[PDB]
Design a protein around this nucleic acid. Structure first.
Ligand SMILES: Nc1ncnc2c1ncn2[C@@H]1O[C@H](CSCC[C@H](N)C(=O)O)[C@@H](O)[C@H]1O
Ligand SMILES: Nc1ncnc2c1ncn2[C@@H]1O[C@H](CSCC[C@H](N)C(=O)O)[C@@H](O)[C@H]1O
Ligand SMILES: [Mg+2]
Ligand SMILES: [Mg+2]
Lengths: 193, 291, 291, 193
DNA sequence: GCATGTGTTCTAATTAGAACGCATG
DNA sequence: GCATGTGTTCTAATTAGAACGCATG
């Protein structure tokens, strides 16, 4: 996916699953003012969603997948979120000919066990990248990311062992880390400000 | 419906069989007369692989555990004209009170079939024929049957082996095979009654037996748990050769690897009813070569 | 020694088989082409009887423990044209260090064969033909072989199964069959090498195997106690169908009564080498009807 | 076997094995004190005797068998004496047309066990008769007899309790016992005195 | 010169058998 | 309106495997 000239960058059309990212996405300038429903589509329960739904929901430029933030509030098994995410991604991908760039991503909030992680890498065809947000005095933020964004897997993030990540599993309870995670997307779509 | 194929343009069939078991898929395809060009089997049970290799003389390419089949494997081993399989049902069937659904335990392995199926699918612009099938038990949670139908984008056809065999075996069958919803009919050589499956000098107490499982208890019928056979004026359980004839397998098909009574019943108890699979694979001989 | 019989005068053979085991005698006679008029078998092992009944479809009359056969029974069930038997060798074979000899334990069952043989013998003035045979192990006390020869008024010819099979089996053969001392020659359908007896994808380490007993240790060859087969780069023991082929029995001959590895080896371990028995019963074709 | 008149009774031709009863047969008067060379053949080891040996030894009117009396003289297994007796018995049988009476008898001095005794009756086609041979004051002698002599099987002898005579065996640790069972042979053959 | 055997046996694995389970026609 | 089941389990019977044995060509 080559870079796009600034004057041809159309607004992004995203599909956000299990988690609403409208607030996090608008903050970095991806969705224009309001009452335009084309920019985002959000579904929380997908057990009854068919391909014809996502097809008619309008072609998408980004498909976002996310697990529940770490807390004892999941009726669903942790593996359920990926299998369903992989299910509709095949529904949302356009024809083999490429009219525009198509991206996708899946974040884990330290919810999947090692068995769920290797199944995750197998189904998303890549081993994940880890996003740490520590300034020494803070331990706060950490997520695992599977994505086809070239810049999500381009630079060299702060390599941290995850014997230290289970120490971060406080389990009792985004702006800096997740926005940094998303910035390389606006080099492909409209900058709204 | 796929277009009809002229008899001269037909090439042998190329099959990907996941959770192959004792190669029931290859058996019915061969007994139908269909030329089998390639049969890639994913199976982890040592005794199961032993049955497939010995009884079919190395025509089956075994590609061990399914979760280690990559994308590159599919197009290297492919293309595949047929993708079949039945995932383990120990965490899905209601015979197990400790089943874990299809999102935990061995129920996840269904998604491996789903994952590898879309790999094998011909890409857009390739109108070549492509058939698939997935089998599992009826006695699963409605949520499990719902989600399986969602991922396969298809609703299952229930076929009970009671109509073509001497045993109760109700199983769901997802797929796109030609005419799966048609009424199934018995053949001449279909052993319809338990007496037809027994050996010499043995008497059958029933016409049909309850569902065969891996365990020896499913052979004693009903809440009584009576023995299904009498011989020499003495009550007895079914024999391995008789279990084979009940499932529609060739006699002594599981006389491999020094297996005893329990081992052979374990492989057969999880297998497919041969005449049921014959009914499903029968319309394929109009799309592939036959000799 | 025996007067020739014209073909039209030939009538089917009537056989008394003591310690019949798995009905080797009947199998050989039938495979030769000889019409079997009557086959009265004395056997006490249920699994052994199960084999003879199922594999031969009830043509064999089982009577029971040999010690309950009376002189009236012999004349009621007779007349017999052939009396064959192999006495149990657990107390006669040198493989048992605690063997009890010919006169105590199980060795005294030989005298039952001797007793019933004279009962079946044609009385003085009966020129009609009559044949018999008795088999036992070579590894037998000198006094026991002497006394057995004394009671039978005959000396044994030793035939080793190695000449016609893929296994060491040296056995003495008392009898009056035509041409028992003739040179043993192999047939075109004899599996002379272990590799001929194995299944697909199995490598024979040896050309010939040591004497097969009832126990699984006789499969481990030599002092090294090595496995005789390699499969997929892994050492392995013989299979039940492979033991059957080693002995010359039809494949799956002992797939009966839910028997496992040990049970089927026990029956075969005591049995006769089929091609050896075929060599002995072959001249009977010139005395009885054949179809 | 019908009775034979007195003037047609020849002397006996007895085959005695394992035990010499020459003193017993001479005493009751079946055997001439002067005879040449003899009318009684005696063998103790029959393991190497063949049919043509017994045939050579001239026609036999009676074949006698006996176990060794209780003691350490039991060189061979107890069943050995029976199988060898039955083996030689068939050798001594004449042509089917019986020219004269043929008699046989086998005696056990309470040495064979029950397993051996039912094997005994099976091979000799007859259940044994026990000789009490016990005076009111003296319970000394006791034997078991299989025989085709009619009078041995014909008439009632004193019944006995096996349980009491099972212990008689190790209390040891002749005429009434065995030679009284020899007397009825006299009528068929010559009486010398 | 030294490996072999129609088995008995004792012990260590190993499997047989039935208890257990309840939503659903 | 009760009976059924592509199984987990735990115990009780099972066998599996190798030690044992030595007269002998
Ligand atoms: N991870 C895995 N990869 C490949 N096969 C597996 C597997 N896990 C289990 N299996 C196999 O999948 C099979 C499911 S039982 C189905 C057997 C087959 N349908 C037949 O006709 O016999 C079992 O034999 C099991 O050994
Ligand atoms: N008392 C008895 N009466 C009849 N058969 C007996 C017996 N005791 C043992 N047997 C049988 O005698 C057989 C000796 S093994 C011989 C087997 C036979 N020759 C074959 O070809 O297979 C054994 O099967 C044993 O079960
Ligand atoms: Mg369908
Ligand atoms: Mg001879």
């Amino acid at each position: 996916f080559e870079t796009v000239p600034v004057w041809r960058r159309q607004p992004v059309r995203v599909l956000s699953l299990f988690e609403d990212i409208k607030k996090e996405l608008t903050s970095l300038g991806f969705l224009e003012s309001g009452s335009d429903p084309g920019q985002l589509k959000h579904v929380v329960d997908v057990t009854d969603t068919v391909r014809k739904d996502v097809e008619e929901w309008g072609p998408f430029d980004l498909v976002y997948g996310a697990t529940p933030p770490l807390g004892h509030t999941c009726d669903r098994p942790p593996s359920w979120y990926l299998f369903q995410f992989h299910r509709l991604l095949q529904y949302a991908r356009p024809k083999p000919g490429s009219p525009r760039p198509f991206f996708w991503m899946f974040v884990d909030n330290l919810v999947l066990n090692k068995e769920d992680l290797d199944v995750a890498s197998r189904f998303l065809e890549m081993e994940p990248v880890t996003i740490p947000d520590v300034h020494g005095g803070s331990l706060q933020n950490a997520v695992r990311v599977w994505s086809n964004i070239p810049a999500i897997r381009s630079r060299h993030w702060a390599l941290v062992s995850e014997e230290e990540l289970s120490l971060l599993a406080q389990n009792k309870q985004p702006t800096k880390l997740v926005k940094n995670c998303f910035l390389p997307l606006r080099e492909y779509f409209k900058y709204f400000s | 419906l796929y277009p009809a194929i002229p008899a001269a343009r037909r090439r042998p069939i190329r099959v990907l069989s996941l959770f192959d078991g004792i190669a029931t898929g290859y058996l019915v395809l061969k007994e139908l007369g269909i030329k089998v060009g390639k049969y890639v089997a994913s199976e982890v049970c040592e005794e199961s692989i032993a049955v497939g290799t010995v009884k079919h003389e190395g025509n089956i390419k075994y590609v061990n555990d399914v979760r280690n089949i990559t994308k590159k494997n599919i197009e290297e081993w492919g293309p595949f004209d047929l993708v079949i399989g039945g995932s383990p049902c120990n965490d899905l069937s209601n015979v197990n009170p400790a089943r874990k659904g299809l999102y935990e335990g061995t129920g996840r392995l269904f998604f491996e079939f789903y994952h590898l199926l879309n790999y094998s699918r011909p890409k857009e612009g390739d109108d070549r024929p492509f058939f698939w099938m997935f089998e599992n038990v009826v006695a699963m949670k409605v949520g499990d049957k719902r989600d399986i139908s969602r991922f396969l984008e298809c609703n299952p056809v229930m076929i009970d082996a009671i109509k073509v065999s001497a045993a109760h075996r109700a199983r769901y069958f997802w797929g796109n095979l030609p005419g799966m919803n048609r009424p199934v009919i018995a053949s001449k050589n279909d052993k319809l009654e338990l007496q037809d499956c027994l050996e010499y000098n043995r008497i059958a107490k029933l016409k049909k037996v309850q569902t065969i499982t891996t365990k020896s208890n499913s052979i004693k019928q009903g809440k009584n748990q009576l023995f299904p056979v009498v011989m020499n004026g003495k009550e007895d359980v079914l024999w391995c050769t008789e279990l084979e004839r009940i499932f529609g397998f060739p006699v002594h098909y599981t006389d491999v690897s020094n297996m005893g009574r329990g081992a052979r019943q374990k492989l057969l108890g999880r297998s497919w009813s041969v005449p049921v699979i014959r009914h499903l694979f029968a319309p394929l001989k109009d799309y592939f070569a036959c000799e």
